[PDB]
Symmetry: C6
Subunit: 203 residues, 6 copies
């Protein structure tokens, strides 16, 4: 389907959890979301995960120019991809809400489509206490109508490291998508009209 | 069913465990209880869990005025939602029974519906000794006629952290409801007849 | 069946393990055993577990006078229910054998029905060596004709905390009953005539 | 089946592992072997396990005189049952072989039936290194024609504590019996073909 | 099935994860790749793993001269096989990518087929933090058109040591092959069509 | 089939993993390999495991003279069974490869059937790092044509202690045999013709 038709499945302010595995080729959905987007794209890049998506798409033969043109907010890492507009540090595997808000202030083209890559990395690295703060990190932004956030997370990484943390994560978001071989399953949604349905937006 | 009928399933003094998961959208049931209750609402908000429920409902388009109008006793956390009448500290992942009673003594309109949110968070953070004190906290109030308590807990979070603790919790409460896709199961009840039955008060 | 016929399933000196879960509402079987008992009742109350049973029954509308009139030996705890004839301190999660006998001497008119509540708590809290001491505490009393003991234990609490202890426990007792939704399963018994059979004495 | 027939399944020098569970009432088999023995009986009583078996049989109504007349070597424990001809301390959850032999040197009527009770307790108490020493002790006696040893072990206790240890144990013994609800299964035997067969000697 | 058609499944710059187990005889596939590659072969030999593949093929009766003539970069280990053009010390279970780059600067006949052997050894040895740096090492080269890398990893070793790590690895590579008894499963590929298909190039 | 045919399933230089369990009575297969053998037999006895196999066979009624007259290289242990031609020290649950070669230097007959007993014990006793060294110890001798080694290992003991280690072990060997009640399964082999097949060599 058309890019903007897909976004119509969500409301401004939502936090969407996109669960995928290593065989899912999640970078394809990320490309679909960024390519020819009608709204401004802002990527929160955790631990150089955007660079990984980028290189995989580049090798696949995609035109990565669109990925290079979006604005990015790095949280750790040393490989800059896209228009970096901010660089936050990660202490105790969590960012500074103070610094983060000071960075988005330079944005004024709201609303924006906000993909967040690499959250599962932070979770794998920390203990229960630090994992809980990472989730608080996510729930702290749910509802801010400045954007629609898409948290791409490798489901298995989180499940196997700490199953309780995955459950907390699915609880605080408003919608949950799961990339499977036959398409994208809408596990949870604000619109009961689409809950449990499977869509194939890339067709 | 009627909201007046749903509440009839319980009697004053009961402690009801409401088990849910990340895909349950448990906030819908909380909203239902808050918006259809004819008694005063007193929420025990553990670690800003109420703010998360409120935020999810708000984004979902619900009129959340009823939520801001209830009385709230905060245990930890920093996000105020509703009329906060007390703030307790989470020392050793538990709360003082003395300081709590000191706060609830300022209430006169009894009985009340008392939703408790975030207990699983407390449990997830503590060890077995601390978890036991949390369970003891819950059993110490079972039977007090000034209210009917609804403990909303993310079942998976507790079961994966300490399965024994989840079973202790289920033992000490008088009723147990579990939210599923088909509806709400009454897993345990004072009424020996309803056990195992499923109801859909929100349809 | 009327309680006194239920008691005929056992022989004086027996130690009966009553296995239940949080959804069993085991307090119902306890009430049945205590109410109108023709044999004296002596309750060993571990860590205020008797108060929890009492409280759930009271809220359920039972006439709990019978529970307040039986003799009780408390092991730890601060909630007094019934005629407390003794208070024993808990050290390393077991009770002094000397102190216990020192207390049971002030008793006459044997045999007695001896409900023991809360053993699973001692196991959940103690270390592996203390868990073994708990089982040892239980086996020390098997065979004494002055009573028939009923150890009410939350099966899941023990098995999910330390499966080996449950096995040791089941081995030292003479009879094992398991409360299920369909009735009480007699998992083990001295009488090969009832082993594997299910009875419903509460009807 | 009669005593002599059952014993013909084994030859002198053999070490037989008798696996059971809490619900098996293994004391019935021990009674069968003791009461029906033309050979002298010598029991290795580890951590008062003989006393436990004794007590269960007594409460069951069995005539425990035959158990009181066997010679016993105690390893730890404080409950004396039978004619104690020796007492040994358990160092690091193992037994000194030089001290054990110094005790059995007083026996002048060979061969004997040697039941060994409570081995799973020594294992539940030790770590891998200490557990390996226990199996070592067991394999050092295999083959000695002065007796036929029957090691009664609670299978689940060992398996849950250390599965590798159970596998090693089964490897060093010459015969393995497992008590089930339908009868005793011969999991391993020097006699080919009877492996996998089930017998009911207590019928 | 084929010879030159095999390499056509991949594009220059790809990173191929080849998953196998102890019963796969994965060396057969390595032999095939080395012996049928028209491009230069450069092997990254981690902890003398090339020597193990080599000895196994030699014993199987294969002509291993082709294995001895490829260029090799040893990462740890003391068993030289092939033509060692560089050696790297292992520190914190990873190597200096900077020194590695210097070592490969001598290569001037690009592209090359780059088999990497023994990665699961570095993973089995390190902790989570170190395992992440190993995966990081792998993702850093994804897309470099100088070669096509085939990482031979014992799947069970990684999965059983750190399941989260296996999922991270599968995520960062562009293609994944899994050796099975029925043939090679293409679990992931830049070509949508072939994903899920099985090929038997060794026929 | 007699040993002669059985050994023909393998070729010199191979390392064969023989997986068994406590109910397998693996000693019977060992007896079959030793009793039956035109080639010289050399047993690597780790932590007195040979004594245990010997004792079980003895109580079973077998003639154990053939086991008493073979050459043995002890790796730890206290029970002397067979003709001990060497004693090796076990440090960090592994054996020095420089000392081993010195002990087999006295061996004039090649090739020899080399049953290695008790490896799972070294693994059960060590951590992951020491286990990996044990595996290296096995892979370092894969391919030496002076013998055909048969490592008798209690699979469950290794599997339950460290599943990864078992997979690593199965990887470095050239053939894998698994003893079951219906016979010996050939889980892996250099000879594709026999792979996956089940044989019952103990049948006369
Ligand atoms: Cl309904
Ligand atoms: Cl009945
Ligand atoms: Cl055959």
């Amino acid at each position: 389907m058309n890019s903007e038709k897909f976004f119509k499945l969500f409301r401004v302010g939502e936090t969407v959890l996109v669960e995928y595995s290593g065989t899912s080729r999640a970078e394809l959905l990320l490309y679909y979301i960024v390519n020819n987007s009608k709204l401004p794209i802002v990527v929160d890049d955790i631990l150089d995960t955007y660079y990984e998506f980028y290189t995989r798409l580049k090798v696949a033969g995609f035109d990565v120019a669109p990925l290079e043109n979006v604005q990015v907010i790095k949280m750790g890492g040393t490989k800059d991809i896209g228009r970096v507009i901010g660089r936050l540090n990660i202490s105790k595997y969590v960012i500074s809400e103070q610094e983060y808000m000071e960075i988005v202030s330079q944005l004024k083209d709201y609303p924006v489509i906000n993909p967040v890559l690499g959250l599962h990395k932070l979770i794998l690295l920390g203990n229960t206490f630090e994992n809980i703060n990472v989730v608080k990190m996510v729930s702290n932004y749910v509802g801010r109508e400045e954007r629609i956030a898409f948290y791409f997370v490798n489901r298995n990484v989180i499940e196997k490291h700490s199953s309780p943390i995955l459950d907390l994560l699915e609880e605080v978001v408003t919608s949950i998508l799961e990339i499977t071989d036959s398409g994208i399953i809408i596990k949870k949604s604000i619109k009961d009209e689409i809950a449990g349905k499977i869509v194939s937006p890339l067709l």
